[PDB]
Amino acid sequence: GVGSSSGNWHCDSQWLGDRVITTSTRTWALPTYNNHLYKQISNSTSGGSSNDNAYFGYSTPWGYFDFNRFHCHFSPRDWQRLINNNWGFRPKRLNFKLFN
């Protein structure tokens, strides 16, 4: 419905023995890209360059979600906990939500 929220703000960390679960929530804005068009791009369209910098490709009207950085998930204090107390870590599970 229009007048009902689709999700809550979840942002904390839980340290559970040999596991740690991080949760992050952020506010995003998405514009219209490319005037809804697909465009061919190249160093020709960028103005030319040397051979080492030539390319050919496409830009799309879509955007994308990226969280491939550690500070997207760990606060500085949580990072301190992790690195001061552990020989190792690795990711196991992921859950992703888009709402409101």
């Binding site: 606060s75 500085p76 204090r77 990072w79 301190q80 001061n84």
Partner: protein, 106 residues
């Protein structure tokens, strides 16, 4: 009643443990004498002692964003390693270490 030099004050603390070598008399005279014996064999004793203590901990669940202050060793080079032995075999504690590095609100 927290002790003023620091620590835990108890009405029934860990009890005192007392130890002594039993006296072993040297050869007594062959005629009776009522005085207490004054001549003893020179003795001492050695052994192992073990103490095991279980401690309960109270963990932090702080919401502080920035990193805390932590006790750490310093990387800079030195002749000896802190809290180790020297070339002559002597162990030393180079500094006093307290307990108050994490933080809490009032």
């Amino acid at each position: 009643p927290s002790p003023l030099m620091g620590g835990f004050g108890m009405k029934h603390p860990p009890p005192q443990i007392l130890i002594k070598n039993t006296p072993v008399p040297a050869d007594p005279p062959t005629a009776f004498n009522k005085d207490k014996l004054n001549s003893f064999i020179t003795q001492y004793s050695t052994g192992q002692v073990s103490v095991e203590i279980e401690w309960e901990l109270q963990k932090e669940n702080s919401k502080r964003w920035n990193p805390e202050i932590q006790y750490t060793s310093n990387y800079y080079k030195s002749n000896n390693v802190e809290f180790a032995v020297n070339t002559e075999g002597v162990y030393s504690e180079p500094r006093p270490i307290g307990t108050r590095y994490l933080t809490r609100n009032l």
